[PDB]
Amino acid sequence: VDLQSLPTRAYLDQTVVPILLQGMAVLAKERPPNPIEFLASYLLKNKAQFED
Amino acid sequence: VDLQSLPTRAYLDQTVVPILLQGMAVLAKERPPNPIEFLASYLLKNKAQFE
């Protein structure tokens, strides 16, 4: 806000970096056979915590 | 190759960081209405490139 005006790094910081940090924490704990898929599912499941 | 020998940071670097860098670059160019959904969809659509 305004997200469209932010430099690249800041835009990513204010949209996806926090949920990615948490998703990667959980990925690193669980070490699943399908890490990319696992992470994608994690993002969809947990988006409300990070404002989606 | 042997992912089991890779600690947390190496493991993440080998498995998800490359596609994340690529997907985040696309996300930052598109700046779509739902960034989290966009990125999750990107991962599924493009994970085949990362074997």
Curated annotation (Swiss-Prot), chain B:
Protein known as: Protein dpy-30 homolog
GO aspect biological process, one term: transcription initiation-coupled chromatin remodeling
Location relative to the cell: Nucleus; Golgi apparatus, trans-Golgi network
Family: Belongs to the dpy-30 family.
Gene name tied to this protein: DPY30
Subunit structure: Homodimer. Core component of several methyltransferase-containing complexes including MLL1/MLL, MLL2/3 (also named ASCOM complex) and MLL4/WBP7. Each complex is at least composed of ASH2L, RBBP5, WDR5, DPY30, one or more specific histone methyltransferases (KMT2A/MLL1, KMT2D/MLL2, KMT2C/MLL3 and KMT2B/MLL4), and the facultative components MEN1, HCFC1, HCFC2, NCOA6, KDM6A, PAXIP1/PTIP, PAGR1 and alpha- and beta-tubulin. Interacts with ASH2L; the interaction is direct. Interacts with ARFGEF1.
Lineage: Eukaryota, Metazoa, Chordata, Craniata, Vertebrata
Entry GO CC: Golgi apparatus; histone methyltransferase complex; MLL1 complex; MLL1/2 complex; MLL3/4 complex; nucleoplasm; nucleus; Set1C/COMPASS complex
Lineage: superkingdom: Eukaryota
Keyword terms, alphabetized: Acetylation, Chromatin regulator, Golgi apparatus, Isopeptide bond, Nucleus, Phosphoprotein, Transcription, Transcription regulation, Ubl conjugation
Biological role: As part of the MLL1/MLL complex, involved in the methylation of histone H3 at 'Lys-4', particularly trimethylation. Histone H3 'Lys-4' methylation represents a specific tag for epigenetic transcriptional activation. May play some role in histone H3 acetylation. In a teratocarcinoma cell, plays a crucial role in retinoic acid-induced differentiation along the neural lineage, regulating gene induction and H3 'Lys-4' methylation at key developmental loci. May also play an indirect or direct role in endosomal transport.
Organism (species): Homo sapiens
Keyword Nucleus attached: yes
GO function term, MF aspect, one: protein homodimerization activity
Coiled coil: none
